[PDB]
Amino acid sequence: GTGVLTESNKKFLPFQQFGRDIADTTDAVRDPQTLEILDITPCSFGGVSVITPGTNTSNQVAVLYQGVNCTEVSTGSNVFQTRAGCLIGAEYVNNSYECDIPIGAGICASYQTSQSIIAYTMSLGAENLVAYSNNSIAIPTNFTISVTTEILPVSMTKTSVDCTMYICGD
Amino acid sequence: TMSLGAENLVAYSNNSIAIPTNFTISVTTEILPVSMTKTSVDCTMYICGDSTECSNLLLQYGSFCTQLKRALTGIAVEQDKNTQEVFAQVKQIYKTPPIKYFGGFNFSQILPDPSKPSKRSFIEDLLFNKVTLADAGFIKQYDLICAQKFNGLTVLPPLLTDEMIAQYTSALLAGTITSGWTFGAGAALQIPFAMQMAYRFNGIGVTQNVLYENQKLIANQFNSAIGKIQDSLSSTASALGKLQDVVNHNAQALNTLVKQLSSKFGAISSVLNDILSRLDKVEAEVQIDRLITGRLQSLQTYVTQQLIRAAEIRASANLAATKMSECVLGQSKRVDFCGKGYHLMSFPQSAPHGVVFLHVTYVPAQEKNFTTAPAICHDGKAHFPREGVFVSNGTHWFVTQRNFYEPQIITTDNTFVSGNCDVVIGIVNNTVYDP
Amino acid sequence: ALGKLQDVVNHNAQALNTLVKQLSSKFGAISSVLNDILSRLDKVEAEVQIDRLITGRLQSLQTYVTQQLIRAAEIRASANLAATKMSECVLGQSKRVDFCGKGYHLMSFPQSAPHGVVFLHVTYVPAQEKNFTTAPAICHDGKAHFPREGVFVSNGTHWFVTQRNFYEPQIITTDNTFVSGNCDVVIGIVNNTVYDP
Ligand SMILES: *[C@@H]1O[C@H](CO)[C@@H](O[C@@H]2O[C@H](CO)[C@@H](O)[C@H](O)[C@H]2NC(C)=O)[C@H](O)[C@H]1NC(C)=O
Ligand SMILES: *[C@@H]1O[C@H](CO)[C@@H](O[C@@H]2O[C@H](CO)[C@@H](O)[C@H](O)[C@H]2NC(C)=O)[C@H](O)[C@H]1NC(C)=O
Ligand SMILES: *[C@@H]1O[C@H](CO)[C@@H](O[C@@H]2O[C@H](CO)[C@@H](O)[C@H](O)[C@H]2NC(C)=O)[C@H](O)[C@H]1NC(C)=O
Ligand SMILES: *[C@@H]1O[C@H](CO)[C@@H](O[C@@H]2O[C@H](CO)[C@@H](O)[C@H](O)[C@H]2NC(C)=O)[C@H](O)[C@H]1NC(C)=O
Ligand SMILES: *[C@@H]1O[C@H](CO)[C@@H](O[C@@H]2O[C@H](CO)[C@@H](O)[C@H](O)[C@H]2NC(C)=O)[C@H](O)[C@H]1NC(C)=O
Ligand SMILES: *[C@@H]1O[C@H](CO)[C@@H](O[C@@H]2O[C@H](CO)[C@@H](O)[C@H](O)[C@H]2NC(C)=O)[C@H](O)[C@H]1NC(C)=O
Ligand SMILES: *[C@@H]1O[C@H](CO)[C@@H](O[C@@H]2O[C@H](CO)[C@@H](O)[C@H](O)[C@H]2NC(C)=O)[C@H](O)[C@H]1NC(C)=O
Ligand SMILES: *[C@@H]1O[C@H](CO)[C@@H](O)[C@H](O)[C@H]1NC(C)=O
Ligand SMILES: *[C@@H]1O[C@H](CO)[C@@H](O)[C@H](O)[C@H]1NC(C)=O
Ligand SMILES: *[C@@H]1O[C@H](CO)[C@@H](O)[C@H](O)[C@H]1NC(C)=O
Ligand SMILES: *[C@@H]1O[C@H](CO)[C@@H](O)[C@H](O)[C@H]1NC(C)=O
Ligand SMILES: *[C@@H]1O[C@H](CO)[C@@H](O)[C@H](O)[C@H]1NC(C)=O
Ligand SMILES: *[C@@H]1O[C@H](CO)[C@@H](O)[C@H](O)[C@H]1NC(C)=O
Ligand SMILES: *[C@@H]1O[C@H](CO)[C@@H](O)[C@H](O)[C@H]1NC(C)=O
Ligand SMILES: *[C@@H]1O[C@H](CO)[C@@H](O)[C@H](O)[C@H]1NC(C)=O
């Protein structure tokens, strides 16, 4: 196998020699020479996603190592820690704007100005408190006739497949 | 034999009408799933964990893994779209002024509490306590989940945090309370809550003087209903059944996918390393192919089940978005759509992977028999009610509303004439007063 | 502009292209070409490879049909929604909120598009609002007068009754209002004169 061997405190009985897991993978072993218990762990791995504005715009990209602390990480000096992982190549900004490239856990990324990729907390909207009281009513004095557009799919492509021709052509 | 219900025959006749004389303000609860767990699967790690020979043999089977990954990513994006559609229906983050005199109604249990770290409400916190999440997708530093992670199955965190969902529901609630349905059309227009409730009463066919002359009773009934909602959501643990069921189904699917790795599928062993160590390349290729095919079919079944369940969740989220648009951003004339009874309003609350609507409805309470008539003859003309129904308590005739007994003397302002008194079936004789 | 329709077309085209490209996979056979297997092997030896190719391509077709069935269910739901919007927004005026566009719905106009429909929803949106002082009712001669259709407003000195969606103040008369009981119950009642025509 391949993995990291660590000292273990598992309570192996004197007759046992190895331990299994849910998927029947050996998670602990007994050293044949020095009868100690070793825990076997997968070494280290994770997903790597690439945040990028279109290649029409810029070839500069940011990288997201998903679900890892910013210590187990090509690698710029712009590391940032999101609940979704470690974000390298994005300058975190205390401002908040509308989400442009959703990264996760409320963190979004955009390409903005000397332009660079920035990461920020997405903005839900501008705050607005209603001037409410028990003898005040706001009544409109004018109107606006708006024309909105709504697009709805209706049908799709009618496809036909020749099973014999596709599988066993002539 | 199961019972459909208690039999009940309606005392019907052609000159008898039952009209309610009192009402009840009910607050029902409706739970709707919105999103599910965003899962990601590493095809190579799941099928051929750290094995070059298995990976090389897996390259033969084409692009099954790429389309499994594409399907999972599509579902993952769809979940955030569902949440955004249900909750992000408000253009601005509204908020109420510090004064909390909403015409005697007590909204303190649904408005946010600043004391808590997350600015959730009391009922929202109860809802979050009633549902336990197997995994939120957050960072897991160095179980039934470690086995999943080591085999390539991970969970992605949702784009909108629970705090953002709480802020969205707070904006919706503040807009509803301080502006009625006006914030769903254009800019929010402030209006006293008593006047907003008077409009809501007018919207179901009851005159506003009923609300104004019974304001304290209605406020007390609403407060009692909210308190009963609190008690029910704090007592019965099995309250949010649907959301917990969604979480359980996703977790069970992942656990089944992991346990499928211990199947031999006809090979000598389920462990790739044992096959590699005990057999030559020619002999081990057959066993590795069997394991690859079995695990690929298991992944296919998991993705198919996920796609069908995601379609179901998308339908539920569309329904929740419609209920937010129609029940919360306005008053609904649709029957049994925003709760049982005549709909007055609704209040949204977030919950793990779902939304909860507190539907406030008006239910007639105490009905009485009366003798009715389609029309009335005064001077050879037939008088019909402009808005209401003719009733009689035994000796005198009045005209009342159709949903609340408020009899008034039959005058020419209440009624309109149409033709003579030789056509209407069931007409009666009475005097119509002239102001 | 028409993102959804183009997305549908792209998804179908991509599915067909994937189905075609699956024909170049060996699936464990010596070759992905049927003719090469037939020419280089005897019947007994070639049957195994042909079976492997047949099984792989059959599974690929199964995946394509399953994806198509799920996507067709999605498109059918969308088409049912479009039919409902045609019935309610175009063939009539809708009271449902945010169903035929944001705002108070006036009308809608349909337009065709490749594999889809486009609705131009005409809606009415209030524009310029002003503050006013309001009151649930009014006392004239010991009776409480409530608006028949509208809301009582005041510009600072005088009291009028207006519509709820458009400021059109009118003198409070007995035709605008109706009486209900006395003036000892309503909370927030005010004092004003009701004109008698
Ligand atoms: C209501 O709004 C409309 C436009 O939103 C106003 O019409 C404009 O009036 C100004 C001043 O006379 C003109 O310069 C514009 O050309 C008009 N626009 C249009 C489209 O007609 C209208 O005056 C407003 N009414 C009130 C009472 O404020
Ligand atoms: C309508 O029903 C409500 C309650 O359903 C009645 O209010 C109750 O009245 C009794 C008698 O005065 C009190 O003891 C209760 O405390 C009241 N309850 C509440 C919640 O206020 C009301 O009296 C009924 N009205 C009519 C006309 O029957
Ligand atoms: C609205 O209801 C809440 C509770 O349902 C009220 O808060 C209670 O107030 C009493 C007296 O002030 C306290 O003894 C309780 O401990 C409070 N409970 C909670 C949970 O806060 C609140 O006072 C009500 N609102 C109004 C305006 O009366
Ligand atoms: C039906 O309602 C009428 C209207 O109130 C009743 O007539 C009144 O009865 C009371 C008895 O307490 C008298 O004091 C009033 O003078 C009566 N008014 C008129 C205009 O007649 C009548 O008694 C009711 N009848 C029944 C059977 O309930
Ligand atoms: C309602 O009143 C009318 C008029 O008072 C009644 O019509 C009378 O009916 C009797 C008997 O059929 C005739 O003799 C009269 O000539 C009718 N008068 C008129 C003016 O047409 C009618 O019968 C009454 N209805 C009831 C149910 O009592
Ligand atoms: C509120 O509206 C009333 C009604 O128009 C105003 O009263 C009028 O004010 C104008 C001033 O230009 C006078 O010419 C009229 O004679 C007044 N009419 C009456 C019946 O009094 C009043 O001034 C307005 N007040 C405010 C604060 O806007
Ligand atoms: C509205 O008008 C009524 C009647 O003009 C006022 O009622 C009077 O109140 C005073 C002070 O409480 C009493 O001394 C009078 O006897 C009352 N008159 C009547 C006929 O009841 C009432 O106070 C006024 N309301 C406001 C807010 O000014
Ligand atoms: C095994 O051999 C090693 C060295 O060859 C020795 O140090 C150790 O004590 C031995 N242990 C046993 C159980 O024989
Ligand atoms: C380049 O692509 C971006 C998409 O991020 C778009 O906003 C921009 O307008 C494009 N520019 C050109 C010149 O096509
Ligand atoms: C990362 O590890 C450090 C210690 O090595 C710890 O203090 C920190 O909380 C960790 N952060 C995350 C997000 O795991
Ligand atoms: C954001 O603000 C905090 C304090 O409010 C500060 O410590 C931090 O350096 C700021 N970040 C940036 C990128 O300026
Ligand atoms: C409005 O409510 C406040 C309590 O917050 C009260 O003091 C005030 O008198 C009320 N105004 C009217 C006009 O009733
Ligand atoms: C009601 O209908 C019955 C027939 O079932 C009839 O005999 C009776 O006269 C009717 N009552 C009135 C008031 O018309
Ligand atoms: C009306 O009278 C009938 C007569 O049998 C009775 O059954 C019914 O309960 C009464 N309805 C009400 C509301 O009292
Ligand atoms: C009404 O008055 C309040 C007082 O603060 C103000 O904030 C609000 O903008 C006013 N509304 C309108 C429509 O002018």
UniProtKB/Swiss-Prot annotation, chain A:
The post-translation modification note in this UniProt entry reads:
The cytoplasmic Cys-rich domain is palmitoylated. Palmitoylated spike proteins drive the formation of localized ordered cholesterol and sphingo-lipid-rich lipid nanodomains in the early Golgi, where viral budding occurs. Specific enzymatic cleavages in vivo yield mature proteins. The precursor is processed into S1 and S2 by host furin or unknown proteases to yield the mature S1 and S2 proteins. Processing between S2 and S2' occurs either by host CTSL in endosomes, or by host TMPRSS2 at the cell surface. Both cleavages are necessary for the protein to be fusion competent. Cell surface activation allows the virus to enter the cell despite inhibition of the endosomal pathway by hydroxychloroquine. The polybasic furin cleavage site is absent in SARS-CoV S.
In the record, the effect of residue 23 to D is given as: In strain: Alpha/B.1.1.7
Indicate how biotechnology or industry puts this protein to use: Main component of the anti-COVID vaccine Chadox1/AZD1222/AstraZeneca; in which the human tPA leader sequence is added in N-terminus to enhance protein secretion.
* Protein localization: Virion membrane; Host endoplasmic reticulum-Golgi intermediate compartment membrane; Host cell membrane
Report the superkingdom from the record.
Viruses
Taken from the UniProt record, the cysteine pairs bridged by disulfide bonds within this chain are 70-86, 99-108
Q: What is the effect of changing residue 113 to A?
A: Partial loss of O-glycosylation by host GALNT1
Q: Which residues are glycosylated?
A: 56, 69, 94, 113, 134, 142
The family line of this record is:
Belongs to the betacoronaviruses spike protein family.
Its domain comment says: Contains sequence and structural motifs very similar to those of a bacterial superantigen and can directly bind and activate T-cell receptors. Activation of a broad T-cell repertoire may be involved in the hyperinflammatory syndrome in acute COVID disease. The KxHxx motif seems to function as an ER retrieval and binds COPI in vitro.
Further facts: Variant D614G has become the most prevalent circulating sequence in the global pandemic since April 2020. The mutation is associated with higher viral loads produced in cell culture and animal models. It would not change pathogenicity nor neutralization properties vs vaccination. May be prevalent because the mutation increases virus transmission in human population.
What name does UniProt use for this protein? Spike glycoprotein
What is the source species? Severe acute respiratory syndrome coronavirus 2 (2019-nCoV)
Taxonomic path: Viruses, Riboviria, Orthornavirae, Pisuviricota, Pisoniviricetes
